[PDB]
Structures are given as structure tokens and as C-alpha cells.
Symmetry: D2
Subunit: 493 residues, 4 copies
């Protein structure tokens, strides 16, 4: 991993529309802070409805029948996405550093993890461009019926702050590969990286209006996209709470297609025959990865009584050794929480746990007085009715529960409004197969956690989502099907 | 076509839950009238939220992991659907008669069209049961990734009164084929046939709770389903106005998956090179089919100026010969409108057209003093800004517009909030191919209209829908995708 | 299981062509014996080249563009296959008895196993008829490209005597479902059941020439089909030796498509952690099922040394209790071998094993002096270089080998010219996953054996086959793809 | 188009095996001539059986379970193919010049056509690498069945001299994308370009033994591949005559999977309503493209009598203006024929035509006395029984036939042992649709010819092929399907 620039230059901080950078119509700007120091990095244009409106306008024009983008060969769409990937890889060190500066995650992670997964996603979707075929259907009668898989049109894509570059990649990959146009709203907590990539999109040679990125606020620029009368589809990734607002907004206006990737409270089930060493480490990772700021975090670690005590002791030790510090330091495992608000939220949950009557095994408090650092907390002897066992904490706060039977763990694990992911650690073939089938979750990992593949779909089962985001599935929501039934003189097989 | 019983006996008029018939919790009942005579056929149990909750409870139980339905082989689901089909064919004469008695459509149509289409739908989806495979994905790293296409769960399905039996079949086919459970709300205007089939479901051997049919009202039983906290998915077919309510209800509650098949104002484009005879008859059919009560009716007949006068003359003559009368009479082409409310609504539009300044060429008034018969009306010299040229009439009221160029007709045809279907009549290959691509419609018929195939998807492009209902596509909405990623010792190709 | 007729009446014994029965052009006939008594059941017309030529002509005519069969709706093809199924189910008892009479397998098996699987196969492919879509391809340039999945044409299908009715169904299901025409060559050892079904094909309403069944001899009628200049595809199931002849014949003449389902020497690997009881019973079934006359029989039972002794002991006991006798007797587990030739071949192998220096644990000799009964033989302490450990025996002769490591068992099990199937018994997830990937077999069963599903493909990896026979894959070989590229005025997404 | 080097340097002329260049075991070499001058360009190592044997050895080793290539992520296979493309694009000018030097085709074509198509093919298949999923199948019983799409293994790929780089690309694309290993035999008449690309494969980072290219002769190196006991699959592109040999070879030995892309006599049907200008130009292109050395050439131009005379005179004029000359000259439309042998063959056919009694409209003789140039010949008034109207000429010799009805032209056009491609020129929708369905051809072009898309399959219907080469279909033949059926505690939907 190349040595990063601990203070990477901010080159873009405006609104990107027709491959052009401009200030908000209001000339208003908002600050973007560095979670590690609490100091302001710079100021970014604050997009609002007026800016969304013009971006939508730009996108619609780019999507007109006869446009360079609509006339473009699917293969060329693939070429553009691969070119974009190349530019991102060329600027990998810079983007990794900026990602960390704006977000807080360890540089090594932004480089080896975030950026690699960003490149793999775009590279993956580049190949789908000319392969998502329609169908020729053996309909009854003397007809020739077939389907066209056309773009759904103008897509509003709202993304969170936990994986800035990756979330952007997950949206643009399938949308662009299918021929759609994008009006994207990026998180006000982390707008810098998305904007830089927006310029690379221009450099890649994408036609104007195809991708418009608008930095701003949620109830402001986000809501304007969700309720716009000319946005054909919305893709939102964030809280279930806001997820509700997105669907409600869609219904109250355009009846635009909606997909949601939202919260979670994922159960990580360790069976007594599981390899302790692997299970403990993976359990640690399952919850602590990315400052605990992952929607599919294993926030409910169910451990079989027979091995509970040992598993708990080992988890606490591992939590005790987890290095929290400067993201740019090679030995830093944990950076700060994205912002003060989240910092307080997490702390509020730790307080709740202690008050609910939970066994605090690892220090649950601030880890520093400068950035938003919190100590890797671990709560043992957790009860299902406890707030921290029910509500998504989104911080470095581990919950460890105890169970006896499979029948019991299935019911407990499944008894949640969420269903984003789950995990099973066991050496037994039958337990693995039984559980993976019984678990009501979009993804079930067996003997592993947080394993993402651009080729494998991801999504929620209940109030944790709607629709899937990767693989071939990720193309479905960005496709509008048209049936064309032509009358023929005489149909033959 | 066998001789029908002009007065078929009503055997079921209650609420169907766990394969059992019972009155509404309130014991309240509502009348179902015969549109031909205006007299009450009988009374049906009026389901409400209390009944909906009971049905959902029943359905959820039937969906329990380990249930006969969930443990059932996919092939067996296919066998049950085929058995159902057989029972409907056994009772084809009776059902065609009852369909007409409660709806008003001609008996010949109910028999040869509706029932045939019903049988073909179920028979088609019966074969999909064991064929909608998941995937084994070549994910990165030492893992074995694959997806499971599981049922979405408890599905709420709300259907209209235009095609009682068929609408029911379009919903049950894909749902049952996939392993889902149903809580269906039937149109209060036409609940009889759906209830009869509900009993056939029981007789076919479907496990209790798998299909629950609730007769009742919209804002009552319908809304109860749309905002239910335990319904995983909603499939609604009706007005766009209500469609909005369904999507808003889903967002404000459960975040349940939603699909909508709604209104339309489909354009029927006749090019100057089209075969007049065919074009004229097909245009007649395109709009007048089923008392004009079809979501995909060719409500806007655009005819190229060069052949406009001739086409109009021929249209009016054909409309003047259209026989309106007793649905059970062999020579009846048009029966009455479903009910007085729709009778008045259609008349209101005829009034509107005359006042908008439209050329009434065919008598626009009631055709009788007993049932809800309206005369096949034809309006010539229509203008895009005219109410009847923008709002869905849902009655035997034809609109004929005049155009010159293709660029012109595409823009005009496309300039609508709707996009359910469209049609183009021409002998030219390039115009056919150009137009089918340019028209923003879920279905584009070329040299034909109203051609439906159980194997070809159907749906709307704008405020006329979301999702497709037939073919393989119809299975998508009834499937929940689960990704299972297993860590393996050493992955190889 | 209904009481069978020990002496079922033979109603059809001639050549079936245009839905008509006639004697061979030579008037020659051959006898069909009853393996249980060694007595002649009756005589069947002996088809030859002249008869094959006539059949091919009939088939070709039925395949003419514009034929009732080619113009028929795909759904109707489905209907015919379901009708056929129903007729077979109606005559289930008769067919099961006749199957046993002519083949030797126990009636219970013929009824509950063979017939059920025949019904399931036809009923399964009936549903594929109108679902095997082609595709609309996003090709470069201003074009509309799409593919048609047309029938391959006239298909020659040659089947064996081990599962008469079943093998017939495996060929007809996919062929007919895709719109092809068939010229079938049935095994001289067991032509009876296939002939009766041929008449059911007539009764089902299949167009004349669509299915022609020709009873006769291999180098006679079989070779005539394989080398015919007007047969578009050949599907052969039998010995690898003859498989070679089919491929060579195809090349020396028509260059017709070829698919082969041939011999095997499947390894059944029992890991030390396997459940003894289950593993022992399944191992017994794996090899002894259908008088050991199954191409995917577990001919090489590799058992982990730690559990070898015990496994062997249990295997011998189970083989010693295996009831051999009258197929019509409820307690008979094993009937006779198909005929004297096979009877002597199996005996020759037992002799070989004894001479090779193998430990005969179970009596290896004739079990009676009337029919072709052989005692369930079990050879312990087998060595890979032994003939019975290399050549397919096709009889009730079990081989039990000893192994130590997984690396060793993989190499040993894979060290064969065959690769039809394999099995792995273990409770460990990793071993299951590892082995199933490492084994070069068309089918790898884990914790079970001989599990067939009409929905899952089956075939060989080396000299044991080419192509797969069930599921969606089974339709591939019966499809000819046509690409139609149309120049369009302006292509858009 | 950049200025080429009229004399590009030959850097590789040996056998490429484990990413290493070596002389044949025999030290024998053969000359490669320049068709334009008749002079020897250089000498190339003459591979033989011994060289094929070692190449297969290398390939097998590269295919061992646990190999870098087998363990490699499918996505990485995609990366390698994209890298290879980049290298080819980097060297596009050199490769196009060398292609023309050794082949004879005009440099502008090699550059703008051949190399573009080469890049597009590899770029296309690079995206398929991680998307050709297997399936999870809803089999009956308590099991989990799924399929694995594994590589077929060692693939022997034999290619022709008409499109050296492109044929190589059509083979390597699908093979490598699927994870197979290759032993390729390149045409003795044109081995240079294929060898240079072989080195780029090394530079790209492909693991040793994955692609082995062997220059040599047909009955020598080609036959050794076709009958090799360790080659799992053979892919051959060439004459139907040799095609027979490949299939017979496969049967006589390994029973290896075979696919054939062979000869043709494609009919180009011009209906009276066709746009003459376009039809005439396209007709010229259809047959004259690449010195008439294309298997899909429109060898039989059927013209409707009403427009026959005009079409004929227009064709002759166009043929009279076709510039034949130095391939490197910007004005050259036609270069020389690949070699003296082909030179003589084509001339022999012209002689035949004259003798069969055909109307020679354009000079049918040599165009120069240096290279292998032949004058663009046009034969009018041809009859179906004439040799030139039956046998593939593979030279600039056009055949123009006259027809009256559609019924007539379908039968005549279809009356051939070949069925590679066909074309229909008409403005009529019904004629287009009717003919496309009626024509027994692997590809039917409507109002265009020789339109190839890496995304759409290509192949023959009779003695012109077996299997398809492009699109998703091209992956089928390079995949071996394995079914894994696991016993599960309790199967649920």
C-alpha cells in the first residue's frame, strides 16, 4: 500500500450537472469536517430542490430518444465504465486518502478494501452492458412476441456516508450499464470523494447529463429527488426511518419505482462445534468493521451455552486489543465515528445498555478528546428485549447473547423487523443447510462474514430493504420491460 | 358454446379463510346487482379489517417453515394448479354464465374468451412451479455463493371488476406457483365468480390458509390489506388514483413490496399504408372490447390524414352496427356497464366531449331504460387537450385523432402520464420497428390489439403501472432472493 | 400398490409409424423372453433399415413447415404431453406389470418407482413447452438482433433395456416439448411397454409421424438411424463401446448432432464420520438397485480404514438378507437379470473377481435354476487394478475398497475413464463441499444415492456421456438456434 | 487509419507451449508466402503429433485442480482477457499490417474490420467470465440440488486462414472466459499473426500452459489434436470435408465433445420491393467481401424476375468498378486470394460455370501475373443444378439466379446441404417475418449482410456446422455441467 498524503487536496466541491461544476443557485455552502480532528476540511456547495430540478432537466435531455447515450452501443457503455474504473485505479492512492480524510476509516482499508471493491463493481457491471438480453416468447396464435429490456429512465440515487465511494459504485454500475441517466444525492457528511469521481466520469467520456451529482442535505436535496414528478425511479440506501419517507414520497407523486437498502440487526450464530479461533475473529470483524458503521453488522452474536463463556472471554480480549487511532497510522484498526451526532448516538446506546442492565465487559466511552473516537465496547448477557439488542447501534458496540437449541436460535434470530443478513458458524453440513434456509435474511454467510461479491446480490428481507443491489439482480430494477406482439402470416415453431 | 343457465345459482357468498366459509365478523352483507336488469342477484358477506386480519393470520400460519405448503414439492404446487384448472374447465359453463350474470359481458365472451384465458393462465403457471431456478455464482475468493428464490410470503392481492375470473387467475397463478400465500380482496361489484373458484381451490387440495378470498369494499377491506403490518407484498390492479394510495400505505407501514397494474389511455396509430379493413375492425375492437372497460383500450385512435376521412366513416358505420343488449343473447356484442356509477361516469364523459367541442358522430347516450346500457359513441376530430382525449373513460366512447408525420405521432402518442399499451398498424417493416421502439408503452401491438399471452409480460410504463404480470416476469415480484455464501477449503473453476 | 396381473396381455407388438401399426417389410419377427421364467412372452416385428427409412420419411413429413405439429401452439404441445401422462397413469397398473414381465424388475418398483418417475418426467417437460425463450440481443449498430429456438428436426432416439418406460420418457419429454419429431429404436430385450405407450401417444392426439417407435436390433435398426442422411440429431443411451459407433456413424454421414448417455463405474466414498446405518443401507441400494443394472451404480465403494471392518461386516449381512425371487411377490427385493447373456456376463465377472484374488464375502453364483437369478455378491479387499474394479459389471456384484486420506480417495475415485456419478457420505461441511467439487462426475450425491429429479440434469464427464438429459439442460440438445439480424432506421436502448 | 509498414517484421515463428517458444521436435519448418507477391515471407516451425502431445501435456498440467488458473477468480480471467485486448489494440497497426502481409486482405479492412472485431470479441467475452451462473434446482424430496458450470478441460481448437486473428479470437474468447485450457492449431497458410498474439497472451499474464499455439499442417498437427486421448473437446472451423474427419476422429478415440463451423452456399433473396441501391451494394458486399473467402458468403443471389434485369446490370457494373490490387493501397477493394491452390480452385470454378452453360457477365480470369489476383466475376442466368450454384467457390465469383414466388424461393434457397446464413431484402414486414422463419439458416440477415455481433451467436444448420460460436451460446460448448444433490434435514420452499 503506497504512502498516502495525509492532507490530500480538495479539487472539486460544487454541483456536477452537464459535465460542468457550478455553485448552488442559492450560493450556499456547507462544511465537511474531518472526523479524526473535528476540524473543517472545506466547504461544499449546498444543492437543494432548484438544483435537483435542473439536474433532472439535464438528465431527461440526456435520455431523449436519439441522444448520444441512447444511440450508443451497449458495448460502448461497457467501455465507458471500464475507462472510469481505470481512472479510479490511476487515482487509487489519492481517493483512498481523501476517503479516509472525509470519512475516518483506516487508509489501509480505504485502499485495500473500499477502492478494490469499487473497481471490481464497476469492472463487473461493465461486462453486463451488452448481455442483459430480452426474450422471444412462444405466444399462442400467429404472432411474434418478444420483450425489450429498456432503461427505466431518470434514476434518483441517494447514498449514505459509511462507504462513500463504494455506495456510489453500487448505484452507478447497474444504472449506467443498463442505459439509464443519474441524478445522485451524496451524503453531506462525506461528499468529497463522490465529487472527484464525478469529474472522472466526465474525463471517461460520458455524455453530458448522464451522471449528475448533487451534494447537499437529506430533507432538502434528497426529498426533492424522492418526490420529483420526472424521476422515473429512486434508489435509496440509508435508514429504515427515511426509507419510509422515500416510499411515501414515491406514492404521493410520480408512482416512480422504488428500491431500498436499509438498516439491520443481523444475528451471528455460533454453534458449539464451530472453530473457536475463526468464529471469535470473524465475530469481532462482523460487528467492529468500519467503526461498526455497517448496515449488515452482526449486532446480535448468539453463542451456544456450551461454548459461551470461552467465546465471551476471547471476544473481550480481542476488543481490548483493537487499536483505535489516527486512520492514517498503519496500525490503526479503528478510526473515529463519522461525526459528533453519530458519536453521541453510539454513546447514548452504550448508556442505554448499561441502564437496561447489561454486562459491560469492555469500556463503553470516548477513546479520545479530539476526534469522535469511541472504545470498542462489548456487552455480555444480553436479553432480546433490550434496546441495544433491538435497535441498530451503528457503532463499535458488541452484543453477545446465549442460546441452547437450534429451534430456539432460529426463532430468536428471526424475531426482528430487520432481515438484511445473518451468519452461521458450524462444521456440520446439516446445521449449515438447515439454518441458511430457516434464516429470514437477504444474505446468510456460513463460516464467514461481510463477504461481498459484485456477482452476488445483496438486500433486505423486511424493514431492512426491498430489491437486491449486486449481480444480475442489480440490473432488474434499472430495466423497463416492453412487450412487442406482431401479427405474422403463419407462425411455426 | 353450450347453452347457459340465464339464472345460475349462487352457491358461495361468504368469506373464505382456512378453506372455510363464514360471515363477516360484523355479520354485515352487501348486495351484488346484475347490470343487465339493475336487480339484486343476492347478498355477499362484507369483509372489513377484522376479517382481513383474521385472513392474514391464517395465511401467515400456512407459510410457517415446516408447513405442508412450504414442505410441498414445487412439482406438487404445479399439480395443484393443474387440478384447479381442471375443476374450472369442468365448471366452465356455470362460471361463464355467473360471470356474465354478475358482470354484464356477453356469455359467448365469458365462455370463449375469459374462461379460456383463465384456464391458459393457471395451466401456464403450473409449469413454472419447479422451473424458476436460483443461481450458483462464480464469486471471488474461496467461497461457494448461490441464491435461493424463496416465496415473498403473505401476498395481498386486490383485483377489479372488469375481468373478475381472469384478474384472479393472473394473481393466483404466479403467487401459488412460487410458494406464496394469498389474502385476496375481490371487487364488490363482482364477487361471485371469485368465491366459487375459492371453493374449487379447496376441492383441488390446497392446504388451508394458502388462499383466502375476502369480498368487501375498497377503503375498507382493500386498505386493510395495503397497510397491514404482516403482509409482505401487495399486488393491486385498478385506478391510478387508488394506486397512489396503495404505494403510500405500503410506505407508511410495512415497507411491503408493491406492484401496480393501473389505468391507461393507449394510442392506436394507423399509418396510411395499413390494410383498411383490418385496421378499422381492430380499432373497433381495441376500444369497444368489454364495454370499453379495459385498462389497455385504444382510447386515442391516431389516423394519418391521407386515410382519415375513410377510416372515420368506416369506424362510425361499424359502431352503428354494434349490437348492444342481453349478454345471454348470441347476437349481443355489447352488454351493459358494470354499474350505475360507471354508467353515469361514462355519460359524464360523453357530455364533456360534446361540450369540449368534439364531433359526436355516433349517438352518445343510454341505450335502454332498464340495465346500464350506453350507445357505442364515436368522437371525431379530437384534440389532445380534450378531457376525453386525456382521461380514461372506461366505456364505449371512441376518440379518433388526425396526424401527419411519424415524429409528430410519436410525440403526441407519448405525451401522456400513462404508458400501458400502444398499437401500430402498417405494412412497412421500418415503421413497425421504429414505432415499437419509440412508443413508451409496456406493450406495443403491431397489426393487432388486445393480444394477450400467458407467456408474454404485461404492465405500465408510467402512471399506468409498476412491474409486469405475465410470463417469467410475473414470477419476479413473488420471489425473495437469498444469497448464501459458504467458505470452502479451496475454490476451483 | 394395486394387485397386478401376473400375465398382462400384450396388445401391441409391431412397428409404429404414422400412428399405425404394421409388420416389418420383411415380415420378420423376434421373440421377447420373460427373464423370470426364461420362456417366450411373444414375438415382435423386427424393424430394420427399410423400416427406419420409412419412419424417417414419416417424421420428416410431420416436420414440414406448415404442419399441424409445426403450427401447433407450444402450450398445446404441453397439453399433449400432460394428456399422455394421464393415459399412462390410467394404465399404471397394467404398464407396471408388463414392465416387470418383460424386464424382470420387482412389480413394486415398476409401479412405485419406474411409473411414478415416467409420469413426473413427462408432466415436467409438459411445462417447458412454452417457456424455452430465445433472446433479443443488444448488438452493435443500427440493428435488431434476436434468436429463435427452433426444433433440431428429426431426432433418432436409441434406448436400453434397464428402465424401458423411463428411458423412453427421458427422450420423448424434451424432444416433444421442443417441437421435434422422433424415430425411436427400442431395446430388443424389452420392446413391449414402449409399444403400448406408442399407442397412447396416438390416443393422446399427437399428429401422425411425430413419434415413430421401431422395435428391432442394434447393428440393424439402431445403426440405420445413426447413419441416416436425414436424421438431424441422435440421442443414444447404452454402452460406451456402441457409443463410439454412434459418434463415428454421425461423422461418416450426416454430421448430425450427437448426445450420449453411457457406461459407468461410480465411486461411493464413505468418510469415517458418516452415519454407519445410513451409509450401509445407501451403499447397498447404490449398487444393488435394479439387479445392479444401473449405469450410475456405486460400483466402487471406498470406505475409510477406520470404519472399513464394521462397514464390510454390515454390508455382507445386508446382502445376505436381500430377498431374490419372483418379481411379483411383495417380499422380492431382487428379480432376475434381463436375460441369459447378461446372466452369463455377470457370472463371468464374479469368476474374474475370484480369480483376480478378491475376497468373496457373499455367494457369487446363480440363485435359481429357472430364471436368470444371481446371488447378491460382495467382494471385499478390492484393488484398483482388478477387472471388477475397472469394468462395469451391471449385476448384483459389490466391490468394497479401503482408503486412508481424502487426497488419496479423490485421485483413486477420479482415476477412471468413466465419470457418470459419484457419492460422498460425511457429516462435515468442508469434506462435502471439497469432494463434490473435486470429483469428476456428472452427478455427485452427498449423503444419498440414485436421487433423480426431472428438474436436475444427468450425464457423463468422460467416456460415460456427452450432454445432459434432464431439467432445462435437456432441452438444449433438442434446440437449433437461429439469429435474425434486422437493419433498423435508428437503434436506441 | 495509421500508415502501415509495408514490410512488418516477423518476431515469432515457432511453437508456443508453456509461454515459451521452441522449434518443432523435428526441427522442420515450412514457408509462409505473401499472396500479393508470391514471395516467401519467412519460415515457421512445423508442429506435428509430438509437438501436439507435449502441448496437451502442458495444458493438462495447467488444468490441474489447485492450479493458479483453476484457483483464479472468474473476474480475474475477465481481467486477463481485457489486458490481452489492450495489448492487441496497442499493436493494432502492426497486427493489421502483418495480417494483410500474410493473408492478402486490404490493410484498411484488417485494421478497421478484422482488428476491431478481434478487440470487440475478447472485450465481450471478458465480461462473461464471472456471469455464466449455474442453478439451484427445486428437485423433489428433502434435498438441495444445484449445478456447477465447470470448464470442459483441454480444448483443441483448429482454425482457418480467412480471418486469422478473428478466428483465433472467436475460439479463445469463450474458452478462456470459462476457465478452459487451449491447444490451438493455426492454418499453415497464415500462422504469423496468431503467433504474435500468443506472445501477447504471455505478456498479458496468462498462466503457462493455458494457451498453447501450434503452427503446422492439417493431417499432421490438426489430426493429432482431433484424435488425442487427452483432449476433452475439439472446436474446428474449416471445410465440411474435414469436418467429417474431425467428428469421426472424436468417435474413434476419446468421445470428446465436438463443435464444427464449416462451409456454406448462403442464398441472398432480393424481393421486388427492395431498395435497389441498397440491395445491389449489399449483394456485392455479400459475396465479394474478403476476396469471396467467407463461409457465409451470399453465393446464390436470388432476384425476383420483375427486377432481375436491372439488378443484374447494376451488379455487373459494380463488379466492373471493384478495384483489385496491392492490399496496402488505400484504393484497393480486393487483394489476392490466399494462395496459388485457392487461386487455381476459384479459376477451376469459373471454368466450370462457363462450361455448365452460364452467362459470364464479368471477366472470369486472373487479374495479374504476380500475385494470386482474380477478376471479380459475375455469372447471370444460373440454374440450381449447376456446380457453381451448388459448391462453395470461396472466391470473387458471383451467382445471380431468378425467381418468381416466395413459396418457390424458400424451397430453392432451402434446397441445399448447407445452412450457415441467408439474407432477405424487402420493405414488407410480413415478407421479412415469413422468410426469416422459413429459411433454414443459422443466421438470417434482413436488409443487410455479414453483420456480426460478438453478442449474437453464429453457426450452421446442416453440413455447415454444429453448435454456435458467439454470444452466451458460445459459452455452452466450453462448459461441463455437474449436478450436486445433497440430502437436507427438511426441504422448504
Amino acid at each position: 500500500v503506497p504512502t498516502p498524503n495525509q492532507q490530500p487536496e480538495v479539487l472539486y466541491n460544487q454541483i456536477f450537472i452537464n459535465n460542468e461544476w457550478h455553485d448552488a443557485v442559492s450560493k450556499k455552502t456547507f462544511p465537511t469536517v474531518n472526523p479524526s480532528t473535528g476540524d473543517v476540511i472545506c466547504h461544499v456547495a449546498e444543492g437543494d430542490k432548484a438544483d435537483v430540478d435542473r439536474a433532472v432537466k439535464a438528465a431527461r435531455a440526456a435520455f431523449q430518444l436519439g441522444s448520444p447515450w441512447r444511440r450508443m452501443d451497449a458495448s460502448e457503455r461497457g467501455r465507458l465504465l471500464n475507462r472510469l474504473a481505470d481512472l479510479i485505479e490511476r487515482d487509487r492512492t489519492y481517493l483512498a486518502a481523501l476517503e479516509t480524510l472525509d470519512n475516518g476509516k483506516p487508509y489501509i482499508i480505504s485502499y485495500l478494501v473500499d477502492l478494490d471493491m469499487v473497481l471490481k463493481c464497476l469492472r463487473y457491471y461493465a461486462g453486463w452492458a451488452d448481455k442483459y438480453h430480452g426474450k422471444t416468447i412462444p405466444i399462442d396464435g400467429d404472432y411474434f412476441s418478444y420483450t425489450r429490456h429498456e432503461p427505466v429512465g431518470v434514476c434518483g440515487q441517494i447514498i449514505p456516508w459509511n462507504f462513500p465511494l463504494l455506495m456510489q459504485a453500487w448505484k452507478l454500475g447497474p444504472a449506467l450499464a443498463t442505459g439509464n441517466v443519474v441524478v445522485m444525492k451524496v451524503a453531506e457528511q462525506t461528499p468529497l470523494t463522490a465529487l472527484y469521481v464525478a469529474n472522472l466520469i466526465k474525463e471517461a467520456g460520458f455524455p453530458p447529463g448522464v451522471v449528475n451529482v448533487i451534494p447537499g442535505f437529506g430533507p432538502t436535496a434528497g426529498a426533492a429527488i424522492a418526490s420529483h414528478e420526472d424521476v422515473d425511479k429512486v434508489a435509496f440506501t440509508g435508514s429504515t426511518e427515511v426509507g419510509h419517507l422515500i416510499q411515501v414520497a414515491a406514492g404521493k407523486s410520480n408512482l416512480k419505482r422504488v428500491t431500498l437498502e436499509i438498516g439491520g440487526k443481523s444475528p451471528n450464530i455460533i454453534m458449539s462445534d464451530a472453530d473457536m479461533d475463526w468464529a471469535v475473529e470473524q465475530a469481532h470483524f462482523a460487528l467492529f468493521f468500519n467503526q461498526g458503521q455497517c448496515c449488515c453488522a452482526g449486532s446480535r452474536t448468539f453463542v451456544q451455552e456450551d461454548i459461551y463463556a470461552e467465546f465471551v472471554e476471547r471476544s473481550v480480549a480481542r476488543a481490548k486489543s483493537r487499536v483505535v487511532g489516527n486512520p492514517f497510522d498503519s496500525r490503526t484498526e479503528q478510526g473515529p465515528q463519522v461525526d459528533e451526532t453519530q458519536f453521541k448516538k453510539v454513546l447514548g446506546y452504550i448508556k442505554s445498555g448499561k441502564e437496561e442492565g447489561l454486562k459491560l465487559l469492555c469500556g463503553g466511552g470516548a477513546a479520545a478528546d479530539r476526534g469522535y473516537f469511541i472504545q470498542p465496547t462489548v456487552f455480555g448477557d444480553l436479553q432480546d428485549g433490550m434496546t441495544i439488542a433491538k435497535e441498530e447501534i451503528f457503532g463499535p458496540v458488541m452484543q453477545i447473547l446465549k442460546f441452547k437449541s437450534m429451534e430456539e436460535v432460529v426463532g430468536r434470530a428471526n424475531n426482528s423487523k430487520y432481515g438484511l443478513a445473518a451468519a452461521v458458524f458450524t462444521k456440520d453440513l446439516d446445521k449449515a443447510n438447515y439454518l441458511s434456509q430457516a434464516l429470514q435474511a437477504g444474505t446468510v454467510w456460513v463460516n464467514c462474514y461481510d463477504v461481498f461479491g459484485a456477482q452476488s446480490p445483496f438486500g433486505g428481507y423486511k424493514l431492512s430493504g426491498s430489491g437486491r443491489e449486486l449481480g444480475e439482480y442489480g440490473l432488474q430494477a434499472y430495466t423497463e420491460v416492453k412487450t412487442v406482439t406482431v401479427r405474422v402470416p403463419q407462425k411455426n415453431s
